[PDB]
Write a protein that binds this ligand. Structure first.
Ligand SMILES: [Zn+2]
Length: 407
């Protein structure tokens, strides 16, 4: 379920060339939407600082700096990452320091952990640690997180998907390497994870239909978090061979040709219900993946499919939940992604409308239960942590990357 999107479509025409139409309804929301970007982004920035502060209060100070959760998704690493994003935007070195203090606590709390991914496990802790240390200029701290990251091993048991599986660990490696700008994690190690991914996908899949196939919890999920999209997405970020490229292209075509009559995407193989429009399941996560296919492959099929997935988000993507995983902050990135790809200000405008909706309405909507605020209300993936993160990323919308998804 979604709020009906009755927000005004983007107007390309230069008006005013007045005169401001008198009978046109002008509330606080419409005034936000009309705002020129410079002051609109400054406004969202100030709001995001208050959210950020609130999140730091609750997850760090109130709790007396004690760490139970730890991971990016719902735990304290979500807070460190938000602090990191804030540092990236503001260059406030106190944000980076606090970041590192949160990481260190997460590290302590994550020994004994068997979680291996960026978003849900220990590779997330180590890769942020190492990147934050590099920014700070602390080489010894860097080596130390780098050694912990390099000690990670993958049970033959692991799944393939993003939250718990190999695409997830491999995502962390790509993230670490891109940011340091070095082969910090070994290219042979990353290539080996890739080959295991194609091996299993090819074994369970049929060259006739979907050339690559996976299962998590015995389910054949299509989406970003546990499905085909998230895996293909990660694979596009590495050096494929020609037949690997065909197989990734193939799996993505398969999904395009086989979506709902509404243009939304199935949660999992033969599902009979068109209901979810989330990053985790549905159009939003898949759109982000097609945008990436579009950038790498430059195919009409992918470009147009990405745009079409964007229309499903535009009409149904205004979820009654605030967050990144399955909410408005997370669906905003669909428009940001389309904007990065096309440079078409209509897509910026669409991200601007979802962000304005959240700033104008979210507090009121959450506090009277018409918007769900996340089970962990201050987490990165469920709570307002992710709204602050999205808000901060609007400051420089062409540099905005869905956290733990886009590289
Ligand atoms: Zn979700």
């Amino acid at each position: 379920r979604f709020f009906r999107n009755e927000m005004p479509e983007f107007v390309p025409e230069d008006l005013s060339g007045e005169e401001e139409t008198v009978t046109e309804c002008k509330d606080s929301l419409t005034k936000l939407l009309s705002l020129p970007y410079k002051s609109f982004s400054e406004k969202l920035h100030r709001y995001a600082l208050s959210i950020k502060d609130k999140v730091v209060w609750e997850t760090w100070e109130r709790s007396g700096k004690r760490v139970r959760d730890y991971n990016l998704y719902t735990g304290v690493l979500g807070t460190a990452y938000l602090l990191f994003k804030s540092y990236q935007v503001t260059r406030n070195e106190d944000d980076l320091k606090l970041c590192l203090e949160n990481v260190e606590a997460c590290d302590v709390a994550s020994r004994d952990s068997e979680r291996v991914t960026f978003i849900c496990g220990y590779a997330g802790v180590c890769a942020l640690g190492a990147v934050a240390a590099k920014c700070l200029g602390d080489d010894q701290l860097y080596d130390r997180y780098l050694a912990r990251f390099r000690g990670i091993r993958l049970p033959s048991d692991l799944p393939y998907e993003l939250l718990y599986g190999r695409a997830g660990y491999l995502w962390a490696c790509l993230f670490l390497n891109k940011h340091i700008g070095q082969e910090s994690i070994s290219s042979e190690r990353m290539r080996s994870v890739v080959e295991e991914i194609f091996r299993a996908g090819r074994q369970l899949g049929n060259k006739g239909t979907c050339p690559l196939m996976y299962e998590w919890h015995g389910k054949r999920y299509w989406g970003a978090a546990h499905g085909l999209a998230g895996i293909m997405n990660v694979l596009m970020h590495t050096e494929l061979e020609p037949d690997e490229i065909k197989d990734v292209k193939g799996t993505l075509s398969y999904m395009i040709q086989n979506r709902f009559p509404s243009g939304n995407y199935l949660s999992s193989e033969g599902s009979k219900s068109d209901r979810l429009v989330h990053w985790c399941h549905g159009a939003p996560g898949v759109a982000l993946t097609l945008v990436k296919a579009a950038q790498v492959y430059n195919t009409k099929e992918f470009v147009e499919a990405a745009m079409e997935a964007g229309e499903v988000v535009w009409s149904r993507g205004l979820l009654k939940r605030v967050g990144i995983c399955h909410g408005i902050s997370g669906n905003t990135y669909v428009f940001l992604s389309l904007y990065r790809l096309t440079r078409n200000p209509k897509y910026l405008y669409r991200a601007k409308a979802f962000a304005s909706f959240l700033l104008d309405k979210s507090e009121k909507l959450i506090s009277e239960g018409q918007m769900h605020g996340g089970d962990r209300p201050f987490s990165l993936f469920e709570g307002i942590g992710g709204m602050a993160y999205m808000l901060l990323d609007m400051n420089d919308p062409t540099q905005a990357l869905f956290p733990g998804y886009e590289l």
